[PDB]
Design a protein around this ligand. Structure first.
Ligand code: BCL
Ligand code: BCL
Ligand code: BCL
Ligand code: BCL
Ligand code: BCL
Ligand code: BCL
Ligand SMILES: CC[C@H]1c2cc3[nH]c4c(c3C)C(=O)[C@H](C(=O)OC)c4c3nc(cc4[nH]c(cc(n2)[C@@H]1C)c(C(C)=O)c4C)[C@@H](C)[C@@H]3CCC(=O)OC/C=C(\C)CCC[C@H](C)CCC[C@H](C)CCCC(C)C
Ligand SMILES: CC[C@H]1c2cc3[nH]c4c(c3C)C(=O)[C@H](C(=O)OC)c4c3nc(cc4[nH]c(cc(n2)[C@@H]1C)c(C(C)=O)c4C)[C@@H](C)[C@@H]3CCC(=O)OC/C=C(\C)CCC[C@H](C)CCC[C@H](C)CCCC(C)C
Ligand SMILES: COC1=C(OC)C(=O)C(C/C=C(\C)CC/C=C(\C)CC/C=C(\C)CC/C=C(\C)CC/C=C(\C)CC/C=C(\C)CC/C=C(\C)CC/C=C(\C)CC/C=C(\C)CCC=C(C)C)=C(C)C1=O
Ligand SMILES: [Fe+2]
Lengths: 48, 42, 304, 281, 250, 48, 42, 42, 48, 42, 48, 42, 42, 42, 42, 42
């Protein structure tokens, strides 16, 4: 059993509930965590 | 659309960074002149 | 006596079925050998018939008399008693004329004796039996691929006692005779030419022998695995692709990353056989009058 | 990616426990439940040849050296490059080989062929592992093994390969070459076999399964069938592995001396004991 | 002749070799099609040749391989994902349409021909091969299904001549309608056969042979292929079949 | 449901609201923004 | 038309440049003149 | 359940901390000059 | 049985009854067992 | 047939010129004349 | 359902639809920059 | 029939101009009398 | 009939001018008596 | 019946004495002392 | 009528015209008695 | 009878008369004394 057009599955309305909460905020739970995590890595230890 | 949201979105970011970071840890372990406790040796 | 019907494998015997008749002969095929039904419920159980004449009573007889030529130089040292003969059934030894006589057949029966006769009867034991993997390959109308891996196989035989040690002026450059003798020559061409590792012709002659357990370690496994469909009949699967040619054309594509065909798998199997003793044909055809050393060849081409 | 008749075979499952959690087709290549594991092992071991390069002195694949641990350190480990990095590639490569021989079983339960293929790479884990888990384990430590390279273990197979004298003398080895020379004896024919059916001389009919008992019977006299050469071609190449492990399960742990010191227990017999004869006399 | 000479005809000609071979291996199957019936995204680094001469074994006419690749045989799958890579799913029962494990294809109606003037495969009742004379003889034996239950009695053999090896166990039902089943998937322990591929309540799903003698090539794809049909699927998910699928040795 | 011929798939707008909406995540943040990653590179340290 | 992304752009095309980026970061470092992080302690 | 509970983190994370701890053991138990359990006699 | 939304599954609130005892408390006592060990390892004996 | 379109220029033709790059690069960067990367300091 | 005889495609007019975008102009600026980013190298450094 | 053209000039004869181009190019570079391009150092 | 004609006597006629020429070109370019393409100084 | 009247006593009777002589003659043939074929000379 | 006629006069025609010549060319070219092409300065 | 005749007669003349000749042509030129093609000179 399958639907017709765009897009499935899915799943209107899940363009802003499934593909933005664990997809765009993934670029936040690791990308923004890198902002504070890297502030003590770039100097350890390229400058010995 | 398509792909996986209740499947391959919490398992495409758990063995993917571990397959890009922790395997990358080995090359900065390939140093023994740097290295974060080998400095005592060199 | 009757013939059993064991619980499903299975088998029913074959009676009086010779084969085909077009170009061969069948009268010389005198008798169908007595069928040794050795519980032939796995493979087969059939003997005879076969081709008979003088394209045949020459390889057996020259095999024989070559076979006869080295064996009496095993009884020569024994002491004329059969006890020592099996005690040194291998420790006995035999070689051609001295490295200071060589080409000269003028060596008596005393010293450099029984190498000129065995290699004389061998020379009609494999050059009329290559004329039966190439002629009986036409006994019906077939191709000759069977003797195109046998014309690059008696090619490593076309350096070891033919082409090296005849235009090199030495028979001691041709291989000693028997069971133990020629192994003080498989560790004699090795101390001498500087270890044949840096020699990537004998060495890459080995790189076509470690690969025939990479093509046949899976061929007898996989065509034993697609058999539960019907790809064991290798003559109804090529053009008429069978249901064992859709249980195989995906596997190695998904696995290692390239599939073949039912005409295709016999074209890497014999491109890892016609090059076993060919790269080593060239890998004992260049270990002579080029650079005697391969440790002093492995410092001039290989890092340069 | 898929063939023209690969429309139907595309079905999920196969994997053990959890679901289709890992079983996604990437290209022609099958990336199953042992797939992102062999992506894990592959992208981790190619640099284990490039690790012993900044230390040993050779980045080039010519003489990269991750040597086996020292002969005398014990049941623990080693130095760094001389056994430690050796001990790192130990469960990276052997972690990958069976992230693949049971990922083949993720293509054997999926359809329904014979379980005989995930079985012939298993002898590749019965001559290699006759070098890590078997011999080095007992007589002391991991020091009784070889460097990983392409060349280093060559002049290790040569120079440190006359330590049992002359190895042709070894009877487990001899007969783990006697299945390694007949290896290619039943392939130079079998390979020409099914080319000369479809392509005879020129324009001639294709052959049928009764022109195999008028050619090979017209050859050497034996004909165990048409599927009796995929059951004497697997009798050629797998067995050059565990009769070679045999003279690597008996060679160095029981008889670390010469194995040319082996062929003098054939003359010590009350029949011909006090009476020499040929060659020896 | 020379030290460095013959090898520069080896990395050039014999390197023009895996380019000449991999194509003779990538014939059948190619050219590439997607998942409906359409010119695919590519072919490969070893592009496919247009087929050459293949004179047919029994004067069957003209067929050139690589050959049939298109969508002539019936295909039906209910898609769960639209992008290429993720597997498909059967509409009804996966043992109904024939999608997934049980694999076949539509072939032309002609029994495999060998030599003398008759089909490749025949039973013992027709090709009077090897009979029964003296002693007790095990022809006519009971069988057990994958559900560990009686299914039918196999009472005849399908004989062979060139390869001297029986091929099929003709399972005649009480109805009289015969059901067919291959050879390298069966194991008899003692007195009664025990199957582990198909249950005793799924044997009619394999249709019958219209001729008890003819072994056409259209019909050697499902009979030996449906056994895989219950090798992928059968049987989820809890209880006595789990103690019949996992573990074991042989 | 089964599919037909060229060029499903394809095709629209599961190629325009999907494949057009997933592909350009590798032809911009690695094509034009990599030139911003070039910023801390194009003089460190080719010029001595 | 044709081709795939909802399968090939999520974990198949993003590391296609990880084939080309991470395989040439290794070469840019080991050099005893460029380095950028290696040689600066001696 | 976002991820699998009785499948991915009852023994599969047990070979996640185990896949890290021991591959580095033969780096820290090893090393040509640390030991402090082997070099006590010589 | 499965539902609809995110995570569902989920399976709200099976996202806060099984991602809590062994996900949080499993990794927080994997952080209460790992950090502590270091405090007998950092200096014994990398300094030699 | 023979050669198609949308699959080569994404992962194959991308490593067909990169392959053709390093078979030119790995030759002209080592000759006792050129360099242009190391020869810029001394 | 699929296609017919050689070639299809083909075909007129389907040849210049999927074989003239990233193959005609996809290998034209690749050749332009092969003269553009080569003329600035024609002079450096075949000359010292 | 029996052989091909749209596969022997579009991808075969088009690589027969690269297989034969560079082979002797470095055979006449290995033999030291041409060189011909090295105008830099001198 | 006989052997391939629309297959055997065209594309494999190349190796008659390819592989035959090259190996006889092999033991010729090297001999310090010939060389012929090494003559430069005078 | 039971004993080959035709089969054994004509064709198998030949190879019986044949083998009962072949390698037993290869015992005390040309021995160091006896000979009686090398003796009636010197 | 026991063997062939056609196949011998095209493919097996070379093993009597070429291989007979080519592996015999090598020996007569070598002996410092003929040369023709090694004459150069003689 | 047992055998046919008139088709082997173009290969028993083809390669036969030289299968008897090649080995006998190789013993008379080995002796430096005769040669006949090496000595008819000085
Ligand atoms: C180029 C270097 C040497 C050499 C290197 C080696 C090495 C290394 C090996 C041999 C081995 C063998 N060589 Mg050799 N060998 C050479 C090339 C040849 C040529 C040839 C020129 O065509 C021949 C006919 C042989 C002959 C033989 C066999 C007798 C033997 C097993 C080969 C095998 O695996 O077949 C097996 C299948 C067959 C059908 C061959 C039949 C021979 C039988 C079956 C095997 C003989 C075993 C034993 C000697 C018999 C003892 C019986 C007693 C009564 C108990 N060699 C050259 C001269 N060869 C192997 C060996 O074990 O030597 C004793 C071995 O390891
Ligand atoms: C001393 C700091 C080291 C360093 C050692 C590491 C290690 C180890 C890792 C990172 C990783 C990352 N580093 Mg860093 N990193 C450096 C070099 C760089 C440079 C640069 C242009 O020089 C940049 C832009 C970055 C930025 C980044 C991120 C791209 C990445 C973190 C996750 C992610 O993919 O997003 N690093 C310097 C030289 N980097 C992580 C990664 O690879 O992503 C999974 C990671 O494991
Ligand atoms: C220090 C030790 C050296 C070394 C020392 C040597 C020496 C010395 C030799 C080799 C040679 C070879 N080495 Mg090495 N080799 C080394 C490493 C290895 C290793 C490895 C450890 O990986 C292996 C597996 C091998 C094995 C090989 C082969 C690849 C090669 C010989 C091919 C052959 O025998 O076919 C031969 C098969 C045939 C000729 C076919 C037979 C044709 C004949 C005419 C037909 C007669 C059949 C007859 C009728 C049968 C009778 C049947 C009866 C009815 C029963 N070497 C190391 C580096 N090796 C040999 C060689 O030639 O170098 C390339 C050689 O002399
Ligand atoms: C004095 C010299 C001795 C001798 C020195 C030695 C030494 C030393 C050894 C042997 C060994 C062997 N010798 Mg010996 N050997 C002699 C001469 C010979 C001759 C010959 C023709 O003369 C032959 C044919 C052989 C052949 C043999 C075999 C019986 C045996 C190796 C088994 C094997 O390879 O499988 C085993 C297969 C493997 C180990 C491979 C494992 C498979 C793995 C899992 C796959 C690797 C994947 C890879 C990493 C990935 C690359 C793929 C890419 C990704 C594409 N020897 C003489 C008599 N020989 C070896 C042995 O017996 O030990 C077992 C050995 O160490
Ligand atoms: C003035 C000399 C320039 C230069 C002259 C060229 C020319 C000409 C070309 C490139 C090309 C390339 N250069 Mg540059 N390049 C230089 C030296 C380098 C060095 C180095 C080792 O320092 C590196 C890593 C590179 C990197 C690269 C590749 C990204 C690119 C090849 C792509 C391909 O697949 O073909 N260049 C110096 C800085 N390079 C090829 C390219 O892709 O076009 C830009 C190309 O034609
Ligand atoms: C330094 C220049 C070298 C040279 C090195 C090359 C290289 C490299 C190539 C050619 C190529 C060609 N050369 Mg030039 N070539 C030279 C002089 C010759 C001489 C001669 C001495 O008369 C001959 C017979 C050839 C042969 C040929 C042609 C076959 C071909 C281009 C012409 C053509 O299309 O027909 N060259 C000089 C001596 N030649 C091309 C070729 O053979 O590919 C088809 C090619 O790649
Ligand atoms: C008796 C068993 C014989 C055999 C059988 C066999 N080999 C097989 C198979 C079978 C059935 C396969 O199905 C599988 C295959 O893909 O078919 C070729 C395979 C195979 N045999 C291979 C190689 C191989 N087999 C060999 C030998 C043998 N194979 C035996 C002769 C040898 C030799 C000459 O000893 C080699 C080199 C591979 C091409 C393939 C194994 C595919 C595989 O399992 O890949 C997993 C590997 C990774 C994911 C990489 C991770 C590993 C690390 C990252 C690095 C490893 C470090 C290590 C030191 C590598 C160094 C290699 C060399 C420098 C030694
Ligand atoms: C590509 C390389 C591989 C290869 C290829 C290859 N081998 C081949 C061939 C090919 C194409 C054949 O065509 C030929 C063959 O027919 O195979 C069965 C053969 C062959 N390779 C063989 C062995 C062999 N294979 C080897 C290996 C290899 N061969 C590689 C793996 C080797 C090695 C390693 O050297 C050997 C020794 C034989 C099985 C067969 C050669 C057939 C042959 O030439 O024999 C002629 C027949 C005789 C000599 C009969 C005489 C028998 C005895 C000599 C007399 C004593 C017995 C007699 C019965 C006395 C009793 C008296 C009676 C009258 C009562
Ligand atoms: C179409 O049909 C056909 C084909 O197909 C195309 C063919 O290819 C072929 C040709 C193929 C073949 C002829 C291959 C056939 C091969 C075999 C039948 C295998 C035979 C192998 C042997 C006879 C080897 C046997 C070896 C033995 C017996 C060695 C003795 C064993 C030991 C000493 C034990 C070892 C253990 C040891 C040493 C332990 C040591 C412990 C301590 C020291 C402690 C034919 C004929 C054909 O008809
Ligand atoms: Fe086979």
């Amino acid at each position: 059993a399958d639907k017709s057009d765009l897009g499935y599955t899915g799943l209107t309305d899940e363009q802003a509930q499934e593909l933005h909460s664990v997809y765009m905020s993934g670029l936040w739970l690791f990308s923004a965590v890198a902002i504070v995590a890297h502030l003590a890595v770039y100097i350890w230890r390229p400058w010995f | 659309w398509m792909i996986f949201d209740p499947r391959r979105v919490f398992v495409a970011q758990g063995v993917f960074l571990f397959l890009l970071a922790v395997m990358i840890h080995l090359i900065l372990l390939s140093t023994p002149s740097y290295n974060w406790l080998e400095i005592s040796a060199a | 006596a009757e013939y059993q019907n064991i619980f499903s494998q299975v088998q029913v015997r074959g009676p009086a079925d010779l084969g085909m008749t077009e170009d061969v002969n069948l009268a010389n095929r005198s008798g169908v050998g007595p069928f040794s039904t050795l519980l032939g419920w796995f493979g087969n159980a059939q003997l005879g018939p076969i081709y008979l004449g003088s394209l045949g009573v020459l390889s057996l007889f020259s095999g024989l008399m070559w076979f006869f030529t080295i064996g009496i130089w095993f009884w020569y040292q024994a002491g004329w008693n059969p006890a020592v003969f099996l005690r040194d059934l291998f420790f006995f030894s035999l070689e051609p004329p001295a490295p200071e006589y060589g080409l000269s057949f003028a060596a008596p029966l005393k010293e450099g004796g029984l190498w000129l006769i065995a290699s004389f009867f061998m020379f009609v034991a494999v050059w009329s039996w290559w004329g039966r993997t190439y002629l009986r390959a036409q006994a019906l109308g077939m191709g000759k691929h069977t003797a195109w891996a046998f014309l690059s196989a008696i090619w490593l035989w076309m350096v070891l006692g033919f082409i090296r040690p005849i235009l090199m002026g030495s028979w001691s450059e041709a291989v000693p005779y028997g069971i133990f003798s020629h192994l003080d020559w498989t560790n004699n061409f090795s101390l001498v030419h500087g270890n044949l590792f840096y020699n990537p012709f004998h060495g890459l002659s080995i790189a076509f022998l470690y690969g025939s357990a990479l093509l046949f370690a899976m061929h007898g496994a996989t065509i034993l695995a697609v058999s539960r469909f019907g790809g064991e009949r290798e003559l109804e699967q090529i053009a008429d692709r069978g249901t064992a040619a859709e249980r195989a054309a995906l596997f190695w594509r998904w696995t290692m990353g390239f599939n073949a065909t039912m005409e295709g798998i016999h074209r890497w199997a014999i491109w890892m056989a016609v090059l076993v003793t060919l790269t080593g044909g060239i890998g004992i055809l260049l270990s002579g009058t080029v650079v005697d050393n391969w440790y002093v060849w492995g410092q001039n081409h290989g890092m340069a | 990616a898929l063939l023209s008749f690969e429309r139907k075979y595309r079905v999920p499952g196969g994997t053990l426990v959890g679901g289709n959690l890992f079983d996604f087709w990437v290209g022609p290549f099958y990336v199953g439940f042992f797939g992102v594991a062999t992506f894990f092992f592959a992208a981790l071991g190619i640099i284990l040849i490039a690790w012993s390069a900044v230390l040993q002195g050779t980045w080039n694949p010519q003489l990269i050296s991750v040597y086996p641990p020292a002969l005398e350190y014990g049941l623990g480990g080693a130095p760094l490059a001389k056994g430690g990095l050796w001990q790192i590639i130990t469960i990276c490569a052997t972690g990958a080989f069976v992230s693949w021989a049971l990922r083949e079983v993720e293509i054997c339960r999926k359809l329904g062929i014979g379980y005989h293929i995930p079985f012939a790479f298993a002898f590749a884990i019965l001559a290699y592992l006759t070098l890590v888990l078997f011999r080095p384990v007992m007589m002391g430590a991991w020091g009784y093994a070889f460097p990983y390279g392409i060349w280093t273990h060559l002049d290790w197979v040569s120079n440190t390969g006359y330590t049992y004298g002359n190895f042709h003398y070894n009877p487990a080895h001899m007969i783990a070459i006697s299945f390694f020379f007949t290896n290619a004896l039943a392939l130079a024919l079998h390979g020409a076999l099914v080319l000369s059916a479809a392509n005879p001389e020129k324009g001639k009919e294709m052959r049928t399964p009764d022109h195999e008992d008028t050619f090979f019977r017209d050859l050497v006299g034996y004909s165990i069938g048409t599927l009796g050469i995929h059951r004497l071609g697997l009798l050629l190449s797998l067995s050059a592995v565990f009769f070679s492990a045999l003279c690597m399960i008996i060679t160095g742990t029981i008889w670390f001396d010469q194995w040319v010191d082996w062929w003098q227990w054939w003359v010590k017999l009350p029949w011909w004991a006090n009476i020499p004869g040929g060659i020896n006399g | 002749d020379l030290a460095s000479l013959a090898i520069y005809s080896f990395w050039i000609f014999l390197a023009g070799l895996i380019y000449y071979l991999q194509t003779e291996n990538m014939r059948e199957g190619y050219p590439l099609e997607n998942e409906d019936g359409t010119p695919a995204a590519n072919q490969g680094p070893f592009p496919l040749p247009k087929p050459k001469t293949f004179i047919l074994p029994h004067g069957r006419g003209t067929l050139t391989v690589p050959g049939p690749e298109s969508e002539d045989r019936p295909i039906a799958l209910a898609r769960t994902a639209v992008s290429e890579g993720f597997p498909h799913a059967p509409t009804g029962d996966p043992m109904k349409d024939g999608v997934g494990p049980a694999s076949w294809v539509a072939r032309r109606d002609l029994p495999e021909l060998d030599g003398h003037g008759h089909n490749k495969i025949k039973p013992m009742k027709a090709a009077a091969g090897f009979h029964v004379s003296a002693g007790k003889n095990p022809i006519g034996l009971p069988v057990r299904g994958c559900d560990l239950e009686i299914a039918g009695k196999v009472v005849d053999i399908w004989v062979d001549i060139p390869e001297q090896m029986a091929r099929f166990l003709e399972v005649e039902l009480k109805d009289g309608s015969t059901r067919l089943l291959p050879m390298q998937m069966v194991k008899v322990q003692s007195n009664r056969v025990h199957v582990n591929a198909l249950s005793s309540d799924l044997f009619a799903g394999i249709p019958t042979i219209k001729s008890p003698t003819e072994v056409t090539l259209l019909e050697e794809d499902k009979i030996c292929g449906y056994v895989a049909g219950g090798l992928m699927y059968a049987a989820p998910k809890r209880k006595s079949v789990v103690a019949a699928m996992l573990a074991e040795y042989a």
